[PDB]
Subunit: 88 residues, 6 copies
């Protein structure tokens, strides 16, 4: 649960994917589950979005963020198994 | 020169692109200039590689790196103007 | 010149790349020359940006644009030769 | 929601047709995709179309990729939808 | 081998809920490799002449297989994709 | 045929400002193909056993070659990259 890029169980059919805000300019941002991407909501120190998912399945998490005020970007991917953890 | 992702002047026709080592597992890594990619060498706290370049031109820097033992990765891009800066 | 995706000569070493506005939500947009990308400025009915270039070379133009208010995107590419054309 | 040129039809509760109205590209090749699973589109009744397995009520990324300018260009269009019973 | 097993880029049935995706070794330097199912990618294990990994899957569904491999001794790569329907074939 | 000309994915010197990039046919369905130099891509022409296209280049400069090809009869593709230095070799 200390990882900046992580997820919360919301229900057996819903996963919240998040990335803690590390200070990027973030003119735009997308949070994605298996490359299905939506704009992240910045709340309580993290960019977050909820998706439909199936407990016990494996997923690719992606965070894509605008950086350097027009001059860059970062894309971060991590694989997870969707469990009942609640971290943030 | 405090920026973790940056470049050093090598000569009028060469640029070193680097990213300070942030602790990724880094089973592979690539440093790129305008999407021409080579494996980075880890030296003095950073992943680094040298490319042909032209002083004064603009370039896209990329750093791509394995993390989480191959369960993840990070790709970082930034645009720079190649100057005589040495960090 | 009547093509919505095109360029203007600025100097022997400068090209303006533009895409006429086709109505996208366009929360973000990038104009690119050989995958070197910058945010486009929307002016006079087109998204535009100026880049260093070399008269007579061939370039890939790219226009990347946010669409559908968070729910989509479009990426358009075209190859050109940089000439003295002004549209 | 049937006006959009980039859209889908219900085929059955387990099958979705994804399509893009033909806008005149050279289209030496084209792909229609569902969640980045891609197949060559068939041009039929003014649109490039293909059918895929899907689950009613799930969210999907639609993609249309097409050649233009005789191989001197291309376009890739993405949009997110929820799979419903609409037939357009 | 039967026709559906000839191909160097292929899959084995493991169970009704598990698929093994593999690519026979073709000689790449292969400092790194990934095997993927619907763009969920894992580092491949090389065993008995092929790079391989097992995934969750549903018999009868369609999947994109991908194999990504390092090539040219630091100077390149190859990425291969092919679509399959997950069946009970067992090949390698 | 010397070492630098052996590989199926390679280049020919055409003149001091032109490089031909090619990939020898390896059997793909190949409904479409692209040959690229530094990610500037053109449809390849198939002639004499290889997919090939010419580009502007400068002797002694380093380039990324890419070959992209349709495969599996509508069901896949392959993308190959390699880095080279442009020299006066003539191979195919």
């Amino acid at each position: 649960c200390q990882d900046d890029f992580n997820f919360n169980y919301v229900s057996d059919q819903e996963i919240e994917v998040y990335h803690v805000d590390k200070g990027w300019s973030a003119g735009w941002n997308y949070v994605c589950l298996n490359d299905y991407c939506l704009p992240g909501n910045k709340s309580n120190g993290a960019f977050r979005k909820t998706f439909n998912a199936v407990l016990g399945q494996d997923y690719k998490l992606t965070f894509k963020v605008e950086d350097r005020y027009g001059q860059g970007q970062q894309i971060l991917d991590r694989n997870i198994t969707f469990t009942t953890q609640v971290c943030n």
